Amino acid sequence: SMTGPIVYVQNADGIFFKLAEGKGTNDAVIHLANQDQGVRVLGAEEFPVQGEVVKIASLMGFIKLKLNRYAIIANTVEETGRFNGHVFYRVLQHSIVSTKFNSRIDSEEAEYIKLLELHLKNSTFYFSYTYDLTNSLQRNEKVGPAASWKTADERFFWNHYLTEDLRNFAHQDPRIDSFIQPVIYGYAKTVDAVLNATPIVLGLITRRSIFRAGTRYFRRGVDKDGNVGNFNETEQILLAENPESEKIHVFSFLQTRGSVPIYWAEINNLKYKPNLVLGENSLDATKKHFDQQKELYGDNYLVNLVNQKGHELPVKEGYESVVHALNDPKIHYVYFDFHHECRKMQWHRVKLLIDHLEKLGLSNEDFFHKVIDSNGNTVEIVNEQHSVVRTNCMDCLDRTNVVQSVLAQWVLQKEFESADVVATGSTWEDNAPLLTSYQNLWADNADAVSVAYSGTG
């Protein structure tokens, strides 16, 4: 990859960064200057001679906080996964570093850094130097050329805004690509297991969306351009050998979760009972949102959890009547009752949801599948996923994680059957240590991703 560990030296003239391993005779230095707070590109000969060299996993970017510019650094990482040679890292220790030995900063500036520190502490960020975690495996397959920041998915490139200065240089200087490492917000982990003497690698990744262009804003809902702002993809990955053949198969199965795509014009008042006005806007914005979702994922199966007995929500009924109004035959809507007691009667109901999705056209054979060679390059695309099940951000993360986990189990079985790791109509979950690894993997994910709010009432 172009990207890799970095070293820096800081002195009275500011901070100077370069790649820890310099390939070629041409290596770039990034300098954050104390003189004018500007970011500059320098020649190798201008890297400081004197000083403590500091090693860091990544320069995540810079931010201008009132008067001073600060470097945002991932100091250390831990490996949390490894898949087809690619290593996935979580950021462990970070720092926010200024050029000022001791500056007196005003209140407003100190408050900004507090708010950024709160976010860096509360979030879990992941990256891989050789694999682009902001894209699904199926999108990465379409990109091709392995990198770089230029083909990252901008919805999930969490440090997109922090890299603006570096991106502007990299447009006319491709050496700067080595400093631009896209990071995702949510979760990325793999586990090794064995199923019927086939070694396997199971992975799960959630990437959370970083919102959002436009002259005005609001988290909940969709803008006029069809973006929703709060949006996650959760992706289950598998790598396995075919027993006879010894061909290496790689699978991905993607799901989405996001705000109800109703226009962000919402009466967030105290008194009294609010009902939406869904003028031409809620039809228009929903249509535009679904046009993008269709281009990205194919057919969309929208799962809306009821969980009411005469307790009626404005945004609930609005979603359905809007979906019903557009009558798009590639958009399929389900309002599903998913109640307690939640360790028997709940999960029964999730298998019933899946039966109903199947009746609407969802197939458990609908997943990305490729064969790769002993060097890890693609030999064959056996299948591409052309649908997605979309759950709502507003339903309990507890319930939707259950829906997502169960659906991914149902698809996994077909993946296992397709590479002949299990017999047709067997149950992979009868393998106790494997189901344990699978269950921990998804419980960890829910832990990680719950980091949007602690609620509700």
Integer Cα distance of 208 and 135 in angstroms? 11
Helix (H, G, I), strand (E, B) or coil at 319: helix
Integer Cα distance of 28 and 18 in angstroms? 7
The 8-class DSSP code of residue 428 comes to: G
Using CB atoms within 10 A of its CB, is residue 64 exposed (0-12), middle (13-18) or buried (19+)? middle
CA distances from 312 to 165, 324, 333, 452 (A): 48, 18, 18, 24
Nearest to 126 by CA among 177, 190, 192, 80: 80
Integer Cα distance of 335 and 343 in angstroms? 21
Using CB atoms within 10 A of its CB, is residue 300 exposed (0-12), middle (13-18) or buried (19+)? buried
CA distances from 140 to 192, 252, 378 (A): 23, 11, 12
Name the method of structure determination: X-ray
CB 202 within 8 A of CB 235: no
CA angle 128, 134, 136 (to 5 degrees): 105
Residues 6+ positions from 412 with CB-CB distance below 8 Å: 236, 238, 253, 428, 438
Count how many residues are written for the chain. 457
Structure tokens at 306: 């009821």
Give bridge partners of residue 77 from the DSSP assignment: 91
Integer Cα distance of 388 and 141 in angstroms? 18
The 8-class DSSP code of residue 399 comes to: H
Sign of CA dihedral 291, 414, 370, 203: positive
Structure tokens at 286: 């929903």
Residues 6+ positions from 111 with CB-CB distance below 8 Å: none
Residues 6+ positions from 381 with CB-CB distance below 8 Å: 141, 369, 370
CB 229 within 8 A of CB 259: yes
The count of other CB atoms within 10 Å of the CB of residue 292 is: 15
